[PDB]
């Protein structure tokens, strides 16, 4: 919207720790709106999905996806909706990818996010239905 | 965005009717997002601010208003919910300025809009409390 | 939709009763589907707008409007709602002038009515702000 | 209803890729009505059977047969879900042959979706009873 | 259905007392059927509308329209429904004819019983819109 | 009541097809009442008793007695309702005895429908509690 | 029943005050039951009935009605019920007469508890429809 | 009661067959209340503890046991809940005995049952904890 | 209890003054119980029916009067919750008097309050019947 | 309070038998107040502690507990509660030594309690996390 | 707490407009704690309680005490939340000494505010009794 | 905030009992707000987690992350909900590492504590999501 410009954040966190670049995005004032708050998180989820992280990431990107559902932004700003459930989704296959454990009770989080995905933009998710 | 990018609309009202104003926004090809509707919607409320309207404007404003509410829009787009709470309050204000039978009915609606004006912008809203 | 035409009813609510004219169209055929259901019953409110019945007509468009409501039939078959909300508009507005002992008690349904056939269609509605 | 003759789209998946068929339809336009956008969704759904997609038939499908059930479109527009809720069958029971381990996950559904089937029409719905 | 078929609690009504009159219905053959007792208790309701009685004609069918309403009876059984309703219409009317004080509280409920009657047989109720 | 004597669906079903029988009671119709509907739908499900079809019956009866529990008809015509949960246990304790996997997959809710025949007419009910 | 069987309270009102003949009551010994505590409390309320006390008597009667309203009472043990009712309403009926300043404001509670007098029994009621 | 004294109801079940006792016992001649009925059906699961039946019992005092629950029977008549509890714990016991595959199922039902026994007399229930 | 023997409170009051009191009484050494903490609020109530104060005693009773409806202490410690009732009744009886325009605004808690100590100990209550 | 002073029913239980013990408390004045009860109640469980009985406790316990949760009495009365609380964690690790099989479903329950004890007094409680 | 120590905030009031004073103040920079913002918030409804304004502070006021009875703030930090519904008491009294027409309206607010005030600091609020 | 400078406590646990540093802080005296209580009751999960101790830590901890998510504390002072949830975190790890039995079960409590600790504080928390 204005607020998500920062590939700065991203050097940052390649110059300094990953803890210094949230620390930033934190930092960065005058946040007043829950729009620029949300896109700042998003931000925040972007630049852990860089390097490691990823636990991290899915765990902001959790979060997003709530306040997403919550406040029904797939009506207005549905591509931030689509990026937030793809990037989950994303994630969540490698999480599964490692460890056969937890991909039964991952199933039904990934199954809904595609769902989802589908909902939102269909042309754009049918490619991600096969695996 | 780009709905809201219609000034030629406004054109239309004064060069046809006022029915010809809102079928042409009606007609025009064409919304999807549940979002651009409701812009274009607000464009609706816009022009019938124009000439006479106004019963017209305080229906299509309480419908724009209510659907904010719903969807939480004071936080995300606040000046968009701002523009519409103010405009309902000057003509509620107005039709209970017209004729006193009705100053008592929407005295709490006027409260309730004026509270939700101050919660968005409370120095924009200081001067909407004395009339 | 496909048992919507049918004039010969409105003869019949002539030459006959309003009763034979009514009973006619219960009868009438193998009628099964919630939707013939719903068209019959208009018929019913339109052929009671004929003569003298109004108050039957009124009850009959209330029915509708209800029903309406709860199928959320603003969305498929608009134009149907439309013709209930502006017919049962039209009547309540005549029994508003007869009496102004009730015109108190219906100003809310028939603001709520304008406000429904706003939503439905702006442009359509726009002529019936000012009575 | 009126945009629902559309076998053009079902052309371009076989020119183009599926993508290209599902984004043709995305952008109709001047898609409005809730019916429009419900019909062209199943017209999506549709041309998923046509080639491999399946999953995302079973996902668009899913999506259209949740909606009928909230608007209640089983008693206005029965033949509609008939067709979602019989396609779904269908490429449930698909899916429960290609393997048997989610057989016994999908068996609840499958019969849910054949008593709404009986439901609807009983006769229709008599050949599908036995698999 | 079978214990409906008593015309003589009539005649002991108009020889002994009415509260002889329902002493003897509320005493008759071990019957538990809740449909027996509704119908038992119809005869009671019908009994109080021959001689002054009114208000405790009223009281009984209030009561029987209260456990129709509960039990869906419109559906199965109308024509009993309608009576009660029409009967209880009569009354009220009646009741709203020998002081005006109530006129204005029993219009409420006279308006309702009408939207009942008219849901339940529209012809037959059209005579009864006009008082 | 007066539709539920048609011996002669029990013929075209051996004559012709199964679904022509069920098609038939549907065509004939010429049905209205919530009453007339579900009459006619328990001629469908005792036809469909008579070849084969038994889960189409089995649907077809749980349908019926789902009717029957929100319209709370073990009061108002309760034989029939026995009749109802009667021909659903028999049809499942058939089920049972073959593949008697479910069968204790089956037990609870044929322990309903003994419990629910006990409390219509435990006299009537007693030789079936002994399989 | 046994409890029921005091009047030795009676007789403590008469000697010693109304207060010593309540202190008796309530020092059991020893009551356990709900039955036996409510049954007390009837008693309480019928030797409130003696001398002057009337609104003590009225507030017993009150408690007690709304607790058999709750244990659905009117069903087990309705002569009970019967007399607390008629006893509420009596004395209902004498406070009405007292100051007419009241008697708009217990109109509804007396018409409730002849409606509740009628539906336990119409024919014992039935004399107290007329005051 | 009144309508308990009955131990020629026992004779009928051993001379005739189980239903010409409980078919005996449906022969009223004057029901009424919901405690005459209550007790009547009492009287049924204590003949159906006389010879096999057991299943029927069970259902029969199931079916008590739930009605004296709203009724909240515990409180006013406790020493017939308990009889109905003790019963109903004591054929369960016996179902659990017969096959240790639904004793599993059963213990939730039979914990709560005599939970209840020892709320209502603990001296009495005691006993019952040890099987 | 034991915090409770505070007449060296009631002193402090007529010595300093009010707010040095109840100040006072805030103080005290370690307190911890929520019982310790409405005693010490009942001393404050107590302290505030000394002087003029009123207002403040009966907006201390009512808060402690709620404190004890949630805390259901009408069961443990009645004598408590008596007092407070009593004390409440008092104190609006005489705001009663004082002017007539709250006289029937006060009415429904009044009546609420005998209700309450009547419940609590009728023998008790029944003096405080006539005011 | 004043009815909890009973070593004598530990008496009565190791003479007599363990109902004869029970059965004495069952019959002891003034049995009125629910904290009597309660109390009286506790004496129960807790002779029911000194020979076997233990699953008796256990049931006189859980009923304690509940009442306790119900009437906030952690808050008015926290020795009895933790007591009660206490007592109940002391025989369900008894129950779960005797058999690991229920060791697994009596761990939620006796976690929840340790928590309940943890948060009436911390210190008193310490000592119990280790078993 | 930190970011409170801002008596500048209400020289620019003088100084400039009454707006520009509360813009600053929204300027912040670059606050998010969300207790500042509350913290924040209670300036602006200080600095709008020095000219005029008034009106906005009571809106001001409403918001920060609705925020503070959801966050639970009379425990935590109750020296802030006696500070507003004080400032509302003060402000709602002025408001009602200036026309009687909602000294009627606000009389309910007025009272809860007390009981609320009394209830974090009767001392202090004691004062407050008489206006 | 005042009554947190407490490390002599900790010195009690090390000289006497781990009950006696407990029963010291219990015994401040006295603490009279529920934000003195809460930091309290800090200190004890503090001091638990010195030596051995863990389980009761564990339960002091849950209580206060409970106590802090209802008054909605993560928004008013989250430094200390942070240390609360790191700490509830920390020792939940520790037990997932002694048993790997507990871990699956332990796994949703420490997902749900990092994600509320990442809603906190990400660039905190970022380095407490690999263990």
Redesign the interface.
């Given at each position: 919207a204005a607020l998500s410009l920062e590939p700065e954040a991203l050097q940052i966190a390649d110059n300094e720790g990953?803890?210094?670049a949230?620390?930033w995005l934190?930092?960065?004032?005058?946040?007043?709106?829950?729009?620029s708050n949300?896109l700042l998180?998003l931000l925040?989820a972007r630049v852990?999905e860089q390097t490691?992280?990823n636990?991290?990431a899915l765990?902001?990107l959790?979060?997003l996806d709530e306040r997403a559902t919550?406040?029904?932004?797939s009506?207005?700003?549905?591509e931030l909706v689509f990026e937030v459930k793809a990037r989950r989704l994303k994630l969540l296959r490698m999480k599964s990818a490692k460890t056969e454990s937890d991909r039964v009770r991952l199933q039904p989080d990934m199954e809904h996010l595609?769902?989802g995905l589908?909902?939102i933009?269909?042309?754009?998710?049918?490619?991600l239905?096969?695996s």
């Open positions: 990953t803890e210094a949230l620390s934190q930092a960065r004032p005058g946040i007043q709106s829950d729009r949300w998180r925040m852990a490691g992280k636990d991290l765990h902001l959790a979060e919550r406040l029904t932004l009506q207005w700003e549905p595609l769902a589908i909902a933009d269909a042309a754009r998710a049918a490619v239905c096969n």
